[PDB]
Each structure stands twice: as C-alpha cells, then as structure tokens.
Amino acid sequence: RLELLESMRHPRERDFYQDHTYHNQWLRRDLEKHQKQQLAARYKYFAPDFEISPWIWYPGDIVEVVSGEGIGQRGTIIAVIKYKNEIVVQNINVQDVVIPASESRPEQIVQREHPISVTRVRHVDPSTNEICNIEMVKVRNKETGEMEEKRMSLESGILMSIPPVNDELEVGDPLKDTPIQDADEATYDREAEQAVLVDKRLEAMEEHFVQSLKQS
C-alpha cells in the first residue's frame, strides 16, 4: 500500500535521510525487548539441555496421545525431530500446508501431519496394549559385550530394540570419489620416516645448543 501512502501526502513536506543515516548503523546494539521475547518464545530449543535425556521415542512405536486435542488416539511414530523435542504421529494433528504459486504452478492446499510435543504422548505396550512407563536398559547385544541400550516396559517387562538411522544412500559422486580399496592401502612404514623426522629435529636442537655454548 506504500505508493498510495505517498500519493496522499503533500509534496511540500520533505523527509530527509532517505539513503543515509545520522548514526552509524554498523554497531552491534541490542533489539528492543518485546521482539527479544518473540525470539525467545519462538526459538526455545536454542537453550542449553533442551534435548530430553535418554531419549526414548523412535519411529515405528505405537503411541497414545495423553493430553490436548486428539486425546485418546493411538498412532505410529512416523518421524522424529529430536532437537525440538517433537514427534510426528501417523494421522494425528493433520493440518493444511499452503504451497505458493510460482512460474509453472498454482497455489496448492495440501494436508500433512504436524509435529506433536513429546510431553503429551505415551507409549503403548505391544503385548498388553496399555500405557506403560518405559525405562531405559542396557543389555549385552548378541556376540557383543557393549551392552547396547533398549527400552523396557516396566509393567510387562518387554524389551524394545532401537531401530537404525538408515538415510539417503542415493547420494554418490563416482568420478570425484575415491573407492575404498584405493583409500585403505597402507603406505605408512613408520620407522624410516620416523628416523628422518627425528634426525632433522636433532640437527636443529644441537645447532641451537652449540650456539648457546658459543655465546656463553
């Protein structure tokens, strides 16, 4: 609306400092306080330790919604946004997403699941189908002394494994990438080059020491 804002005023009234500014604007000086509050309220996950400790929720688990809208609905965890402490649950909290117009496309209104807070969702026991309080347990993996961590339901005593992190394997750059048989060839013979290094340290150390002897 800016141009009609300037079409309604008088030509007689000047407004100075159109491209420059009396005070230098390249100093760092803080924002006014209520937009600092906007930043804080919008950006909470920048705080230290906002990530929840030994994080239980992994995609594929069946979960009830305990409080808020959709209360009492069971779903499956689709995706995990971990640093925000948020969870996408299957066909729960589904709202519209507006995909704007462009050169080739019109504006599309497209339904999508939206992230739910982790606070209000609780696991469902795969056996009993009840809400179980899950504790986190270390168990020696098969053939492995590392005792990797699984999640147990305290009521029924059931262990749930952690799924893998499998990702885009669809990315590759063959010309510019070294193959593994190439990269894993050991060229390090250490004793020889070690001898060379050590001798050429020795030379300088001796040289400065004899210079010290000189000026003494």
């Binding site: 394997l169 750059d173 063959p174 510019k176 990438d177 070294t178 593994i180 190439d182 990269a183």
Partner: protein, 116 residues
C-alpha cells in the same frame, strides 16, 4: 633507541619510500617496527589512525578511509636501496609453494572418499 632500522621511521629517500608498519616472520633475522608493547601502543595506533604527514606533501601509510591491519601485512622480506627499488635481503621468507605430483598411486586418489 629503536630496534627496527631507521629507514622505516623516516624514508629511505626524500619521498619517504619505506616508512610504515613492517611485520617479520619470526624465524627471520631482520626486524620490524611492529611491537605490541604498552609503550609502543601509541605510535602504532598513530600510524593506523593518522598515518604520517611527510614534508613532501604526500601522506604516507594510511591516507584514506580504510585503516590497515599491521597484523596481517605480508612479512618484511628485505630493505630498500635507491638503485634497485627493493633489495631482497631474505628469500627464505617468501613462501615457495611446492607440490609433489605423479608419484605412486597419487593419480588414483580423489578429493572425497566414497560410501560402502
């Protein structure tokens, strides 16, 4: 007196050829007038803000709007002589970039490593 030679205080010639800040590779015998000591702190700033007004009507070092960093100058590699404008007294301070090539399997190496 002054550790740094006297040609960088007043010029090597009448037009004040060699004056300003000079930083030294600290493996090199020659020395510059960049000293971070408290007692030297006025005059280095005195170069960075003022610069110097030579009697020849030309303002040396910083005459402009962008004050020079004395810290990131390339190293002092020599001393000025009137005949050949700059004598290189030390060549070992100039970085000679040298890269080994076409040795062994080096040709097969590529900037990134592939996936499994």
């Amino acid at each position: 007196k002054n550790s740094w030679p006297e040609w960088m205080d007043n010029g090597a010639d009448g037009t004040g050829y060699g004056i300003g800040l000079h930083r030294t590779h600290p493996l090199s015998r020659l020395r510059g007038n960049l000293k971070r000591s408290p007692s030297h702190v006025p005059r280095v700033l005195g170069m960075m803000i003022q610069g110097v007004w030579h009697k020849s009507g030309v303002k040396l070092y910083f005459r402009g709007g962008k004050p020079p960093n004395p810290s990131v100058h390339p190293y002092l590699t020599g001393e000025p002589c009137p005949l050949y404008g700059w004598k290189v007294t030390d060549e070992s301070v100039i970085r000679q970039f040298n890269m080994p090539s076409i040795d062994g399997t080096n040709f097969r190496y590529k900037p990134y490593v592939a996936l499994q």
